[PDB]
Amino acid sequence: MKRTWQPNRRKRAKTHGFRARMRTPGGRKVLKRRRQKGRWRLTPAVRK
Amino acid sequence: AVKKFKPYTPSRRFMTVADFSEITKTEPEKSLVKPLKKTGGRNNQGRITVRFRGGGHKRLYRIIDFKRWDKVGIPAKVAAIEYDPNRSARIALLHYVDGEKRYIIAPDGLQVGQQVVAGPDAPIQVGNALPLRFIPVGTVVHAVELEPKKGAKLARAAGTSAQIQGREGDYVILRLPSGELRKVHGECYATVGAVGNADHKNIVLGKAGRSRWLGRRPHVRGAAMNPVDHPHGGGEGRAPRGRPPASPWGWQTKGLKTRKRRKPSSRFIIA
RNA sequence: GUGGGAGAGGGUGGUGGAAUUCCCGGAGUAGCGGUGAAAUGCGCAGAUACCGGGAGGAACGCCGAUGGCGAAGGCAGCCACCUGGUCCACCCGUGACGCUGAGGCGCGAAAGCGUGGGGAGCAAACCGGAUUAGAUACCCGGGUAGUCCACGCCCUAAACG
RNA sequence: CCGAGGGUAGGGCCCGUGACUGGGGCGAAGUCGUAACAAGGUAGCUGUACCGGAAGGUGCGGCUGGA
RNA sequence: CGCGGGGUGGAGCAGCCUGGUAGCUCGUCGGGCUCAUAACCCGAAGGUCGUCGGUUCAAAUCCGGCCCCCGCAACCA
RNA sequence: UAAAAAUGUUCA
RNA sequence: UGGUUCGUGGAGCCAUGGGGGAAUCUGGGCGGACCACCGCCUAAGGCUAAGUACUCCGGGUGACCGAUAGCGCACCAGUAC
RNA sequence: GAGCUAGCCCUGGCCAGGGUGAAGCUGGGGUGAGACCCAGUGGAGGCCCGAACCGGUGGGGGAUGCAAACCCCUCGGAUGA
RNA sequence: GAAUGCCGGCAUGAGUAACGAUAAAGAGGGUGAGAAUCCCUCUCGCCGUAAGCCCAAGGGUUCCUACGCAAUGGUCGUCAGCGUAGGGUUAGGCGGGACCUAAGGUGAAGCCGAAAGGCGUAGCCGAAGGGCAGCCGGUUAAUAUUCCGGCCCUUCCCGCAGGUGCGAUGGGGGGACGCUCUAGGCUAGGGGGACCGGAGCCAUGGACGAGCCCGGCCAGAAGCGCAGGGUGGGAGGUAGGCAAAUCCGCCUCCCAACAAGCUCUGCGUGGUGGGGAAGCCCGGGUGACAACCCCCCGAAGCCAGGGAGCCAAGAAAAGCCUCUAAGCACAACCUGCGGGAACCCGUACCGCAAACCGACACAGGUGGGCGGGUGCAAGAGCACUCAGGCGCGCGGGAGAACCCUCGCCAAGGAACUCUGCAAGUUGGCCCCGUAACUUCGGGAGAAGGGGUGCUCCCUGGGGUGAUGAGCCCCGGGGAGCCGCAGUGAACAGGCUCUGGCGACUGUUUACCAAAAACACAGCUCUCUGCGAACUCGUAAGAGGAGGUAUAGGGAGCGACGCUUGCCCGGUGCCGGAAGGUCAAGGGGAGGGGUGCAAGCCCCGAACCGAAGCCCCGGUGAACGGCGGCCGUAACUAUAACGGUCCUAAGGUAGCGAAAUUCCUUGUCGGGUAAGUUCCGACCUGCACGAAAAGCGUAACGACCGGAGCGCUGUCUCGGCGAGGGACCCGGUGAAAUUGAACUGGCCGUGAAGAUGCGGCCUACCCGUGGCAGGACGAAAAGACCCCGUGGAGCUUUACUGCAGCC
RNA sequence: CGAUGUCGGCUCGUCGCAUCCUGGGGCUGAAGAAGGUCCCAAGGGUUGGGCUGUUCGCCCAUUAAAGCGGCACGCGAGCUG
Ligand SMILES: NC[C@@H]1O[C@H](O[C@H]2[C@@H](O)[C@H](O[C@@H]3[C@@H](O)[C@H](N)C[C@H](N)[C@H]3O[C@H]3O[C@H](CO)[C@@H](O)[C@H](O)[C@H]3N)O[C@@H]2CO)[C@H](N)[C@@H](O)[C@@H]1O
Ligand SMILES: [Mg+2]
Ligand SMILES: [Mg+2]
Ligand SMILES: [Mg+2]
Ligand SMILES: [Mg+2]
Ligand SMILES: [Mg+2]
Ligand SMILES: [Mg+2]
Ligand SMILES: [Mg+2]
Ligand SMILES: [Mg+2]
Ligand SMILES: [Mg+2]
Ligand SMILES: [Mg+2]
Ligand SMILES: [Mg+2]
Ligand SMILES: [Mg+2]
Ligand SMILES: [Mg+2]
Ligand SMILES: [Mg+2]
Ligand SMILES: [Mg+2]
Ligand SMILES: [Mg+2]
Ligand SMILES: [Mg+2]
Ligand SMILES: [Mg+2]
Ligand SMILES: [Mg+2]
Ligand SMILES: [Mg+2]
Ligand SMILES: [Mg+2]
Ligand SMILES: [Mg+2]
Ligand SMILES: [Mg+2]
Ligand SMILES: [Mg+2]
Ligand SMILES: [Mg+2]
Ligand SMILES: [Mg+2]
Ligand SMILES: [Mg+2]
Ligand SMILES: [Mg+2]
Ligand SMILES: [Mg+2]
Ligand SMILES: [Mg+2]
Ligand SMILES: [Mg+2]
Ligand SMILES: [Mg+2]
Ligand SMILES: [Mg+2]
Ligand SMILES: [Mg+2]
Ligand SMILES: [Mg+2]
Ligand SMILES: [Mg+2]
Ligand SMILES: [Mg+2]
Ligand SMILES: [Mg+2]
Ligand SMILES: [Mg+2]
Ligand SMILES: [Mg+2]
Ligand SMILES: [Mg+2]
Ligand SMILES: [Mg+2]
Ligand SMILES: [Mg+2]
Ligand SMILES: [Mg+2]
Ligand SMILES: [Mg+2]
Ligand SMILES: [Mg+2]
Ligand SMILES: [Mg+2]
Ligand SMILES: [Mg+2]
Ligand SMILES: [Mg+2]
Ligand SMILES: [Mg+2]
Ligand SMILES: [Mg+2]
Ligand SMILES: [Mg+2]
Ligand SMILES: [Mg+2]
Ligand SMILES: [Mg+2]
Ligand SMILES: [Mg+2]
Ligand SMILES: [Mg+2]
Ligand SMILES: [Mg+2]
Ligand SMILES: [Mg+2]
Ligand SMILES: [Mg+2]
Ligand SMILES: [Mg+2]
Ligand SMILES: [Mg+2]
Ligand SMILES: [Mg+2]
Ligand SMILES: [Mg+2]
Ligand SMILES: [Mg+2]
Ligand SMILES: [Mg+2]
Ligand SMILES: [Mg+2]
Ligand SMILES: [Mg+2]
Ligand SMILES: [Mg+2]
Ligand SMILES: [Mg+2]
Ligand SMILES: [Mg+2]
Ligand SMILES: [Mg+2]
Ligand SMILES: [Mg+2]
Ligand SMILES: [Mg+2]
Ligand SMILES: [Mg+2]
Ligand SMILES: [Mg+2]
Ligand SMILES: [Mg+2]
Ligand SMILES: [Mg+2]
Ligand SMILES: [Mg+2]
Ligand SMILES: [Mg+2]
Ligand SMILES: [Mg+2]
Ligand SMILES: [Mg+2]
Ligand SMILES: [Mg+2]
Ligand SMILES: [Mg+2]
Ligand SMILES: [Mg+2]
Ligand SMILES: [Mg+2]
Ligand SMILES: [Mg+2]
Ligand SMILES: [Mg+2]
Ligand SMILES: [Mg+2]
Ligand SMILES: [Mg+2]
Ligand SMILES: [Mg+2]
Ligand SMILES: [Mg+2]
Ligand SMILES: [Mg+2]
Ligand SMILES: [Mg+2]
Ligand SMILES: [Mg+2]
Ligand SMILES: [Mg+2]
Ligand SMILES: [Mg+2]
Ligand SMILES: [Mg+2]
Ligand SMILES: [Mg+2]
Ligand SMILES: [Mg+2]
Ligand SMILES: [Mg+2]
Ligand SMILES: [Mg+2]
Ligand SMILES: [Mg+2]
Ligand SMILES: [Mg+2]
Ligand SMILES: [Mg+2]
Ligand SMILES: [Mg+2]
Ligand SMILES: [Mg+2]
Ligand SMILES: [Mg+2]
Ligand SMILES: [Mg+2]
Ligand SMILES: [Mg+2]
Ligand SMILES: [Mg+2]
Ligand SMILES: [Mg+2]
Ligand SMILES: [Mg+2]
Ligand SMILES: [Mg+2]
Ligand SMILES: [Mg+2]
Ligand SMILES: [Mg+2]
Ligand SMILES: [Mg+2]
Ligand SMILES: [Mg+2]
Ligand SMILES: [Mg+2]
Ligand SMILES: [Mg+2]
Ligand SMILES: [Mg+2]
Ligand SMILES: [Mg+2]
Ligand SMILES: [Mg+2]
Ligand SMILES: [Mg+2]
Ligand SMILES: [Mg+2]
Ligand SMILES: [Mg+2]
Ligand SMILES: [Mg+2]
Ligand SMILES: [Mg+2]
Ligand SMILES: [Mg+2]
Ligand SMILES: [Mg+2]
Ligand SMILES: [Mg+2]
Ligand SMILES: [Mg+2]
Ligand SMILES: [Mg+2]
Ligand SMILES: [Mg+2]
Ligand SMILES: [Mg+2]
Ligand SMILES: [Mg+2]
Ligand SMILES: [Mg+2]
Ligand SMILES: [Mg+2]
Ligand SMILES: [Mg+2]
Ligand SMILES: [Mg+2]
Ligand SMILES: [Mg+2]
Ligand SMILES: [Mg+2]
Ligand SMILES: [Mg+2]
Ligand SMILES: [Mg+2]
Ligand SMILES: [Mg+2]
Ligand SMILES: [Mg+2]
Ligand SMILES: [Mg+2]
Ligand SMILES: [Mg+2]
Ligand SMILES: [Mg+2]
Ligand SMILES: [Mg+2]
Ligand SMILES: [Mg+2]
Ligand SMILES: [Mg+2]
Ligand SMILES: [Mg+2]
Ligand SMILES: [Mg+2]
Ligand SMILES: [Mg+2]
Ligand SMILES: [Mg+2]
Ligand SMILES: [Mg+2]
Ligand SMILES: [Mg+2]
Ligand SMILES: [Mg+2]
Ligand SMILES: [Mg+2]
Ligand SMILES: [Mg+2]
Ligand SMILES: [Mg+2]
Ligand SMILES: [Mg+2]
Ligand SMILES: [Mg+2]
């Protein structure tokens, strides 16, 4: 049956994007933890 | 007249529709800077701020002239009389002699090929629009401005009208279609006569749907809504309000007077 | 046919004043009201009485008559438009073309019903005050339909000469 | 092939009967008021309308079969 | 079983709360008005205050025991 | 436009 | 109203949203209501090292661990998942 | 976090084939004119049967399942809220 | 050693359950160390609005090829969507971008907010929308309207020639648009042919037969036909297009008009290009220089912005025409013809799925397009079947119980049961023929029936043709034949009577409730005059509304019919410029602390002081509420009548043991052999009752109740049979649970239901198939109950605040 | 209470006796036939329906009779619900 994850690449970049984060002051403050933690991906990986 | 329908299906036995004679001859709207895209969703920025709106026929806006005092003394031949889905009332399409054409809310008796005009100069006959101060006391008029130069805002519903009761100072006194009794500036313009299509009040939607067509979503009593949801809500199975009638926000809904006591508008009114 | 006459005959649109009620302004006091007698009620939060100004509804005094018109029901301020019936004279025109009328169709006071409007006065129901052995009556103070208009029904009556 | 009748099914007319229920007629001396006949002590009657233990009361119009 | 209310002339109710005094309406009895009946008028009689004790000098009245009256509650599994 | 006033068993 | 130990308390002092509203040293503020003496200091402009804090980084010690310990990672982990 | 779910906005798409037979017309009849009654034409409908599609009514299976809601039979709607 | 402790390892159950849809397999060859499982061939079965083709999304090399199989493959594997390696995705005309705007996002200005930030004009961003130039074949192991072949277009720049006042982001036109139903021509697609072209075939009795088998196309500019869509031409004036215009819009008038012409598509034709079966011989050849014609059916597509009707009244901007403005007219556009110029991104492969969403090659979920033939009325339905793809990755046997899915059954026939639950009967089309009731539409497909094959003859209409043959499409009438049977297979209701609730279609608890619940048209009350009320927000602002009382919000009631009574004492709301009360504040009589004083400070009485409360009235489709006791009639009974008490008033109409009645299976009546259910009545209605509506109501209902008829394993009562498991063999191989175990019965005893204590009785050791009584059997540190001065959600005339409003 | 799933039905029963029936027996106000009461005796039997969820009852038609109890008001790792 129609499950929770239903991928859409446009929706992924628009939502957890990078330009996407950087807008919100919370979103900038994500990158910070992420980047300070030493993640290899500050953003969900999804290519066009 | 209102058409009725034979009971070959319920919902459509109680149904009635507008008499559509007074219109015809033109049904496609006068494109010429006359329609506009009409933006159309229930709420404001995020949140619904008028419960129970939505759906309902795609609909286009006719921009209508509500302050006739531009083309003053310019006369104008009424081209036809059409349907506007943004009002209870009919609107007529006139062609001025400038060439310039505008929509106007179409009063009872107004018939195609009438000359018609605005200004003080103007003769007291249907569809002509004068400054109240120049209008003969106790005639019926419609689309009255309230503060002068701020446009028409009174009497515009299907078949409504204000009547004059006489002047007193710079203000004339009108009985509004509500019955109230407002001193109004004489400089307010107002087109003469009653708004007609007054068989409107006579129509029966008939079925659940139809309502939807006009984009009026279903509505639910406070009862059948849990207590968290609403005053009247709750109680083990059907129970007499609770005391006393309230909006789902908390305010008495039988009786409780609402307008601003200390408002300036007060002291021009009387009814 | 011609030429004249009288009439609240009917439908429509407009309009005049008197009076009642309410609103406002003024002035002015202690009672007004109502009854067989009272009380209920109203009023010193300033009523009744008087003056001015405004709204609204309904009905139309005098003329009015024991009068007139209409087939009946019925019809009464004034004006105009549309329209029915009727009498008279002239004796001109048609040539018995007539009377009645089972059905059918039409109209039809009041109350009553439906859809809108309107609502001053009155007033079924209803509340109160009395009266009475009891008053669900008669009398009194209130009062909703209704009474009014448009359209659509009902279509009965001591619709009686 | 018709065909008496039998069967199946659904109708219409009529008669009898039925717990219970509506009003009616009639039966010397039961109870409650007294509406009407003399302005029957609110003139009467009437069509309608609502109401009331009951006769009845009131509204609206009508008659005179009263003044 | 529970909690609370009430037994007062013949009928319906007052009187108990801050003990000494039992009142209203109807009825009933005598007497009037009428020719009579009702109505009305004038007069009067009528109560162990459910009961068994005890508090007080005094108890319808304050206190416990029952007899009937009337109401409310009797829930969760 | 008149005050407050109900009633009278059956049969001859 | 906040600050101070001060939670209205005899409650001043320091700030200050609202109202009123001076003077320039015979001018002003304070010394815990308030006056009187006696003293302290000079408001409504501003700058100013040092001693103080922390340690992503480097160095040295460790009656600190010794791979279920020690940082989540002694091992291409903030990965695979 | 509305890439599931609920609502709304903009923009596109989809609904086989059957079966009833509204109004309007057109003709005839009717009347003073009408109301109106007949056939024929006409395709109305939160109309009916029935896929697709949207649901999930009753029963059975399943219950460390094929599946953290599934399968079989049956059933509601299907130009409309 | 104990924390249902933490991590890791390894046991038990177990060689057990299971190996993922009952669409299905068999054999002969090969390859190999070895294969039911890989390759080939011949049979057989399954899908086919498909389990078949083409896209979009998502995935992301899974595509192709050469080597391989350790692990992944629930068995095997010589195979693979697996490991290693190498190849593979070619565009000016396809999709997206150097075009446009939609919701919405952002956002110069401008407004707002302690900060972070929030609104918002123009503008820009934003698309399966508008705009825009490619069709057909051929090649690769794997790519192509992308390479190539043929035919056909698009833009820019430049040059030449010929024409014109050229000229904007500005003006106007246009783009531009709903639903439903249809006209005519075509086209896609398909069915025939005694015609054309073909390898072959007579095979078992017969047929060389207008026999059987197979195929008889596709694209194509100019020009031309055939269907249509769009479209009046004029000349003057002009107070409008925020007039800058000879453009548009308005008027006034010589002509013309169910037209003609101009113009733009569709389709046919077309120089010519390409394709071209079956079969047979090894994907290729041959079948060939293949044939490539006629007729019939025919669209949901094309001409299309065509027409008609209806209302709930149906996007925007650009390209595209046109008009002028600055400016420039050696400019500049416009029309031909030439040369040149034409980028960035995606092109593999899966794609209803073993390559996407579900941890799994998970019987689930997934948008668009094509979807052949025959028959059944039609159809994307059903049965078989083209093309094309499959046999679903564990098998071989045996045939017990038992389980699932399925078929049949004597006599009966709901006797089963909470309930005919389940299953059965019914079941398509055509024609008869159908009741009460009704709002006249319905109820109706009511019921109850008859027909339903094939053969021959006669006969009526239509479409295509030419009125005439064919070819299809609707009929009517006669005779005759065969069976148990003719919608002989498959897909297609059981019917009725009578209550309850809700009017009706609709909606809901995704995962136990689809309903008498919600919604619904309609009814009433109330608020709101418009910078409306109301809602969201600190505000700005926005919704309401680019609306305006025949309008908007709140509340309840719920089609429709007949109706909706009495009490405002109390609570609420509404109305009362008199009063009582009242906070700051005003006011200061009078008092007090200090100083030698001027003074500086404290308290502080009358009085003047708002809303609110009090008080006065009003208001029920505002919250609410609508009694008791005793007596009475010439038989008894009953009580029209009376008395008295209390209330704010004391339940009217209509219903009534009712979804409401406790006593109750109330008491009669009906139905039944028998009925605590049901229907009809009565009515001491423990606790009906009028818009939390009252009483009714045709039609509706996968709603709840009662009764018939029909038919049946539901049952008396069971039996037989089919397949899929269960059992046996081979292969792979789990689970919860588990103090350890050498884990019998009775009578007892024991913390009160002992295998483990006592007495006694039985009892060789070990398994396999079964059954389920016990191990107070497993599972979830009981949901119930209590406890915790534990926690939440909810309410109000609990307390204290706060938003809001006065 | 780190859970012993509750009424009724169905299926399968088993045991007790204070025996409903059948077999013995003593009294009887036992003439006979029927009965009354008490004693011995469960070996085996101890029906089908209507109503209600019902156990229980009350009815219909029978019968030799239509017994009463225990077994966690026997039995849900057997079913129903
Ligand atoms: N038959 C007359 C109609 O019925 C009624 O009449 C009946 C009754 O009303 C009437 O009853 C009367 C009563 O009215 C009057 N006030 C008292 C009288 N004793 C009664 O009498 C009645 O009952 C008694 C027995 O009790 C019988 O003996 C007597 O015959 C009978 N008439 O007697 C009639 C029966 O016979 C209506 N009242 C009358 O108006 C109507 O027109
Ligand atoms: Mg996308
Ligand atoms: Mg936002
Ligand atoms: Mg609602
Ligand atoms: Mg609820
Ligand atoms: Mg409330
Ligand atoms: Mg609340
Ligand atoms: Mg309730
Ligand atoms: Mg409530
Ligand atoms: Mg006055
Ligand atoms: Mg005349
Ligand atoms: Mg009348
Ligand atoms: Mg009435
Ligand atoms: Mg009326
Ligand atoms: Mg009056
Ligand atoms: Mg008297
Ligand atoms: Mg009166
Ligand atoms: Mg009349
Ligand atoms: Mg008369
Ligand atoms: Mg026969
Ligand atoms: Mg007698
Ligand atoms: Mg009288
Ligand atoms: Mg009398
Ligand atoms: Mg009289
Ligand atoms: Mg008289
Ligand atoms: Mg009368
Ligand atoms: Mg009556
Ligand atoms: Mg009366
Ligand atoms: Mg009268
Ligand atoms: Mg008493
Ligand atoms: Mg007494
Ligand atoms: Mg005494
Ligand atoms: Mg006496
Ligand atoms: Mg309970
Ligand atoms: Mg008497
Ligand atoms: Mg007498
Ligand atoms: Mg006698
Ligand atoms: Mg502080
Ligand atoms: Mg300050
Ligand atoms: Mg100091
Ligand atoms: Mg000091
Ligand atoms: Mg100091
Ligand atoms: Mg500093
Ligand atoms: Mg070491
Ligand atoms: Mg570690
Ligand atoms: Mg080690
Ligand atoms: Mg670690
Ligand atoms: Mg969503
Ligand atoms: Mg005609
Ligand atoms: Mg017709
Ligand atoms: Mg439908
Ligand atoms: Mg349907
Ligand atoms: Mg269906
Ligand atoms: Mg189906
Ligand atoms: Mg749903
Ligand atoms: Mg199940
Ligand atoms: Mg099970
Ligand atoms: Mg279905
Ligand atoms: Mg220990
Ligand atoms: Mg465990
Ligand atoms: Mg472990
Ligand atoms: Mg085992
Ligand atoms: Mg086994
Ligand atoms: Mg097995
Ligand atoms: Mg098969
Ligand atoms: Mg093989
Ligand atoms: Mg097949
Ligand atoms: Mg992709
Ligand atoms: Mg491959
Ligand atoms: Mg290989
Ligand atoms: Mg391997
Ligand atoms: Mg393997
Ligand atoms: Mg590979
Ligand atoms: Mg743009
Ligand atoms: Mg923004
Ligand atoms: Mg696009
Ligand atoms: Mg596009
Ligand atoms: Mg390929
Ligand atoms: Mg090419
Ligand atoms: Mg120029
Ligand atoms: Mg030009
Ligand atoms: Mg433009
Ligand atoms: Mg066509
Ligand atoms: Mg073609
Ligand atoms: Mg062919
Ligand atoms: Mg042939
Ligand atoms: Mg040939
Ligand atoms: Mg042969
Ligand atoms: Mg073709
Ligand atoms: Mg043409
Ligand atoms: Mg022209
Ligand atoms: Mg200009
Ligand atoms: Mg061609
Ligand atoms: Mg070939
Ligand atoms: Mg570039
Ligand atoms: Mg490609
Ligand atoms: Mg491809
Ligand atoms: Mg598909
Ligand atoms: Mg598989
Ligand atoms: Mg799958
Ligand atoms: Mg998968
Ligand atoms: Mg789908
Ligand atoms: Mg087919
Ligand atoms: Mg068919
Ligand atoms: Mg199919
Ligand atoms: Mg398999
Ligand atoms: Mg049988
Ligand atoms: Mg048989
Ligand atoms: Mg039974
Ligand atoms: Mg039974
Ligand atoms: Mg019948
Ligand atoms: Mg019926
Ligand atoms: Mg029926
Ligand atoms: Mg319903
Ligand atoms: Mg429906
Ligand atoms: Mg659910
Ligand atoms: Mg369900
Ligand atoms: Mg449902
Ligand atoms: Mg619901
Ligand atoms: Mg209604
Ligand atoms: Mg707006
Ligand atoms: Mg409104
Ligand atoms: Mg409203
Ligand atoms: Mg309701
Ligand atoms: Mg009240
Ligand atoms: Mg009140
Ligand atoms: Mg009051
Ligand atoms: Mg007030
Ligand atoms: Mg003060
Ligand atoms: Mg005040
Ligand atoms: Mg009484
Ligand atoms: Mg009853
Ligand atoms: Mg009963
Ligand atoms: Mg009750
Ligand atoms: Mg009975
Ligand atoms: Mg009953
Ligand atoms: Mg109720
Ligand atoms: Mg009421
Ligand atoms: Mg109510
Ligand atoms: Mg209701
Ligand atoms: Mg009812
Ligand atoms: Mg439904
Ligand atoms: Mg249902
Ligand atoms: Mg078998
Ligand atoms: Mg094995
Ligand atoms: Mg034991
Ligand atoms: Mg031992
Ligand atoms: Mg032992
Ligand atoms: Mg065993
Ligand atoms: Mg066991
Ligand atoms: Mg077992
Ligand atoms: Mg357990
Ligand atoms: Mg526990
Ligand atoms: Mg609890
Ligand atoms: Mg607590
Ligand atoms: Mg327990
Ligand atoms: Mg345990
Ligand atoms: Mg014995
Ligand atoms: Mg039963
Ligand atoms: Mg037993
Ligand atoms: Mg038990
Ligand atoms: Mg169970
Ligand atoms: Mg058990
Ligand atoms: Mg057990």
PDB file of C-alpha atoms (C1' of nucleotides) in Angstrom, chain G residues 33-37 68, chain I residues 7 593-594 599-601:
ATOM      1  C1'   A G  33      12.092  57.237  55.313  1.00  0.00           C
ATOM      2  C1'   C G  34      12.008  62.452  56.957  1.00  0.00           C
ATOM      3  C1'   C G  35      13.979  67.136  58.754  1.00  0.00           C
ATOM      4  C1'   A G  36      18.503  69.827  61.463  1.00  0.00           C
ATOM      5  C1'   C G  37      23.473  70.071  61.961  1.00  0.00           C
ATOM      6  C1'   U G  68      33.235  -4.454  26.473  1.00  0.00           C
TER       7        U G  68
ATOM      8  C1'   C I   7      27.869  -6.671  25.059  1.00  0.00           C
ATOM      9  C1'   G I 593       8.112  65.068  62.432  1.00  0.00           C
ATOM     10  C1'   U I 594      11.663  68.362  62.493  1.00  0.00           C
ATOM     11  C1'   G I 599      10.280  76.492  55.762  1.00  0.00           C
ATOM     12  C1'   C I 600      11.058  71.224  54.213  1.00  0.00           C
ATOM     13  C1'   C I 601       8.436  66.888  54.966  1.00  0.00           C
TER      14        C I 601
END
